[PDB]
Design a protein around this ligand. Sequence first.
Ligand code: ADP
Ligand code: ADP
Ligand code: ADP
Ligand code: ADP
Ligand code: MG
Ligand code: MG
Ligand code: MG
Ligand code: MG
Lengths: 291, 291, 291, 291
Amino acid sequence: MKIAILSRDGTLYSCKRLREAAIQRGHLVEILDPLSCYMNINPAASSIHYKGRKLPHFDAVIPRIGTAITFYGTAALRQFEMLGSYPLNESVAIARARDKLRSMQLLARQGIDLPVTGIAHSPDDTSDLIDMVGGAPLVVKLVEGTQGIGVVLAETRQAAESVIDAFRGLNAHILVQEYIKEAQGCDIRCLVVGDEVVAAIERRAKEGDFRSNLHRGGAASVASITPQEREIAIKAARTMALDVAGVDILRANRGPLVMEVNASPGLEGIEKTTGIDIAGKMIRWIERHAT
Amino acid sequence: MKIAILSRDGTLYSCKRLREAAIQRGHLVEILDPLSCYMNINPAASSIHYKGRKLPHFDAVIPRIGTAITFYGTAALRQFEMLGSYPLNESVAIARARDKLRSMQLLARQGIDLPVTGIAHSPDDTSDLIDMVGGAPLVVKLVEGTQGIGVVLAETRQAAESVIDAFRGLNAHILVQEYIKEAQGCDIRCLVVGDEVVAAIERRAKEGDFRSNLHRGGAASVASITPQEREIAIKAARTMALDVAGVDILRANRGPLVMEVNASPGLEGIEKTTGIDIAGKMIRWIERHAT
Amino acid sequence: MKIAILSRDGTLYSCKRLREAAIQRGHLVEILDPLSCYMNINPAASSIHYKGRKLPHFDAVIPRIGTAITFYGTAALRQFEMLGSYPLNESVAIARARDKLRSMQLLARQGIDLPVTGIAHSPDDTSDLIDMVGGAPLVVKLVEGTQGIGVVLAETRQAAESVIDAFRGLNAHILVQEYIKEAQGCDIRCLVVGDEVVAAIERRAKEGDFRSNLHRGGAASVASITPQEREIAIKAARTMALDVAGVDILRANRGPLVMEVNASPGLEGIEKTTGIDIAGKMIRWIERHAT
Amino acid sequence: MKIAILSRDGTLYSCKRLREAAIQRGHLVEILDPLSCYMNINPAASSIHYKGRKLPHFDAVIPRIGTAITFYGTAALRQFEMLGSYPLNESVAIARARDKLRSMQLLARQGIDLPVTGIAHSPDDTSDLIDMVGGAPLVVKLVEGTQGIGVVLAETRQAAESVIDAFRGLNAHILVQEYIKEAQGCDIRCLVVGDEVVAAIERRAKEGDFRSNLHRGGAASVASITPQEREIAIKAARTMALDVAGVDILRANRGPLVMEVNASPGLEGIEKTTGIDIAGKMIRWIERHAT
Ligand SMILES: Nc1ncnc2c1ncn2[C@@H]1O[C@H](COP(=O)(O)OP(=O)(O)O)[C@@H](O)[C@H]1O
Ligand SMILES: Nc1ncnc2c1ncn2[C@@H]1O[C@H](COP(=O)(O)OP(=O)(O)O)[C@@H](O)[C@H]1O
Ligand SMILES: Nc1ncnc2c1ncn2[C@@H]1O[C@H](COP(=O)(O)OP(=O)(O)O)[C@@H](O)[C@H]1O
Ligand SMILES: Nc1ncnc2c1ncn2[C@@H]1O[C@H](COP(=O)(O)OP(=O)(O)O)[C@@H](O)[C@H]1O
Ligand SMILES: [Mg+2]
Ligand SMILES: [Mg+2]
Ligand SMILES: [Mg+2]
Ligand SMILES: [Mg+2]
């Protein structure tokens, strides 16, 4: 079947691997830059054009939508949807999942155990806000629109006060979250494809730091996750209505706490440390649901 | 009943009039700046705090959400919702309605007759894109994220070419739309509250211009709208799931063409040229649905 | 004589008072919005146009250049200069004085006693940077380009660490400065016009805060400044090549420490608490140097 | 001698070639990321720190200052200057040369023949502005602060009108410039090092386009420049006070017209099409002036 991959870049590992795993399974594959799409929305279901030509009808389409071109990207994805394609992750689920606040809210509402987090833009009693989330030490993450630019630890009460009113009226909102010290800087990225966790790794932060992220200098090992964690990661990915999701989990004394739910997570590190054909698993899932 | 008004400013005409019309009908009213809210999202339904104190439970809440504080604003609104308040316009309908692209798509999908419009970010054959929407003359509107900053007319083919690749790769997407010359610069803003158009005015652009907008220098008269227009404005406001909406319509030879659907439209001009108690009508609608 | 006032707004107190004090002394005055100027730079000295007409030759021009329209504002000012007008503050001195870093450097180079301050964008050893400026407590001010958006206090070592790497790689540079605790939140804004301090006030920060600024909630009294302070404020305003300057001073145990040097300072508070005709003094200075 | 290269990236061709040509001539070379510098400005001449250590005294320093980190970059460069290093391009000349408007003004003032250009931010009579620069066809370049994001051609009067008020009030200023049609899309980048043009190439725009730039798809040949062009390129680079400059010239019927003067131009294309050791020439110039 013919399938498109929406990604402004098609050389990076994940998009390359998807192209490869899809031709390998007997499919035709085009990689399309969203920003180079253009189409009539009115009338409904008018074809999409790409560099002077119409496009053929794609039976399915993988969105790898840049965190920064989200509105136009999801607009193009939604046109493909309205024209009949099958989305590996629907556009409205992508939109929902971008807004980290809307998502934490939806998760807590469904009884998913998250860490205790509060939110604030230009608050007026920083001491009240700190008391609200259980006091120091705390993690302050901040966000410009949907983009989060900083995650920082504050171990004292004054450090929290300083960071909060440093960001106060800075025109970005912020989350203050209980610092899971017991994680020792470790985070478990599970990768849900449809109704199963198909992979999982453990990221370990480099010494003197708490930031799990690989790029920030972290180790990546293979993770052996409890059945409880598997269950709650699938429930999370359901709650968000994602066909493909990257659920991040912190192991806290009271249990597993979801902290982030990505909707087009990177493949390279998790494949290269587990050896699982994840692109293949999601192309299977397409095959099983495409038409 | 106790009701909040979410607006970063509470002195401007519309918020003042809502406060006035609500105390006048025997209600308690607080005006809250969203950015000064702060709350726990986890656990679910934890109270909201405002300048060092908890808030009381509001039976309903009017969002007047700044076009620029939309994510945090709708997050706070959604907390009020999850805590039991009634929203005059739900948060997800607000979010949907912000994204002008998602909205034009949803409208065309429901068979609402819009003007022929195409969309594009970094297109590659400007001549193909112009041919796509019926050629010159055309209106090019552009948008940064959801924010639109410019609307401009292009009467020649070269003017359209110049404007398009002037914006090409400018990192904003753009809509190219058929210029409704027959409107002679006139636009009809209807105001839907629940299931009825409660007001309507006609904006006339100042000579030498096509931009209907009042601020851009336009006249405002009372509009007498056809029953067809009333029907299609209510259908539009339904389609978007808005309890209160400002539907803009261009009168084109083939009929009435929706062009914009605002979700917290300004009241001052439409009240001051019609004399209708619009704030009263929407407080009624609250009363009828609150609890 | 004919004189222009470059200010995007002409209703605010300072520009109104300048217009008033200038017509009152027998002069013709136009207030021009820089952004509405347009001119040929090549050939040199071609006239300036403003809303469809040429402008007359102004014998002098007061720049009140918005902190946010600085490049185009100073471009227009420089055209007036090249065309013969006299600038109350030259364009290159304005440009220099915007960049707070370049200015602190120039001041320290001339032996002006500033507080000990260090600068940093994406530093790599926050503990080394803190040790560099004498350790906690410290004031962290940050800047986007030339715009500074935040000033914040950090009293502990961990608070300083948290704020610094909260801003680290945030794409704004930052100054870390010795906290002058002995100022008890008090700051002395002197206003230099030519070769004399013509006014001065003391700003007192509201309790529980250290930020002197009036808007942030500060009291304004009349200041009686030492001759030393007068001397060093005139030297500072010289060093920057400003004809009109607002020099801010902190009273520290070792002496008076310049901390900020504005080049178009506001008049309203300092006039309304001292009763000095400051607009008159600078129109005099024009008269004395114009031609 | 010890010499630093200020560039946030040190792998790109120009910085690599400078390192190579400098060790090759018997010098010690460090490549420093400006944003990773941090220093005390007060007291004057306090050492610079880089990743936890002090820096040694550099006898000279090459700025390759990112167009986007200009203020902090030039601040760090100015610290090196005040500490005794020799700058291949001084910091204030760099600052001057960034602002394209200030620079066109300075050039026209010195009698350098530029193309006829006018400037405008939020003009009010677009037809007057077009008439001002000689009417269509025209080139509209626009700029955000100092950053220019778009260059576009307008061949008709309506195309110019459309583009201008498309950008009007867009919060960027714009230049309207006479379109040098006789250049047939060709531009001559000369590279001045001290008092001599050491290289020069001709860029040819790809068919259907007028944009000379290499990346935009242009050919690069070796240019044989008149003595007049050599003279006026050296005069331009003088006027700006640059030790190393990239002067761009359009060949117009009335003569050679400077159009752009870069202060850290790229080396790769001009070296790889001429075979001149340009990095060597500027390291020579250092040697001749260092100390
Ligand atoms: N509540 C927390 N407790 C401890 N560490 C956290 C917490 N939240 C985030 N982190 C750290 O930051 C990393 C990712 O945080 P995240 O919110 O994903 O920031 P980013 O969006 O930059 O990746 C994790 O590996 C983890 O170490
Ligand atoms: N397709 C069109 N044909 C004619 N005029 C239009 C068209 N689209 C917009 N306009 C003009 O612009 C005004 C509003 O356009 P709009 O998209 O709402 O811009 P804005 O968001 O700045 O208000 C209207 O009053 C109308 O005159
Ligand atoms: N080094 C310092 N020590 C104490 N207070 C300071 C210091 N620097 C700034 N402040 C406080 O902040 C106010 C202004 O700081 P400033 O740098 O001017 O910020 P802004 O640019 O927001 O006005 C002053 O009134 C003062 O109280
Ligand atoms: N006045 C002009 N006439 C013709 N072509 C021009 C003119 N100005 C710029 N260009 C074209 O654009 C290219 C560079 O323009 P420039 O201002 O340098 O834009 P950029 O900053 O994007 O490089 C040149 O090669 C040239 O073809
Ligand atoms: Mg993460
Ligand atoms: Mg409108
Ligand atoms: Mg200040
Ligand atoms: Mg160029």
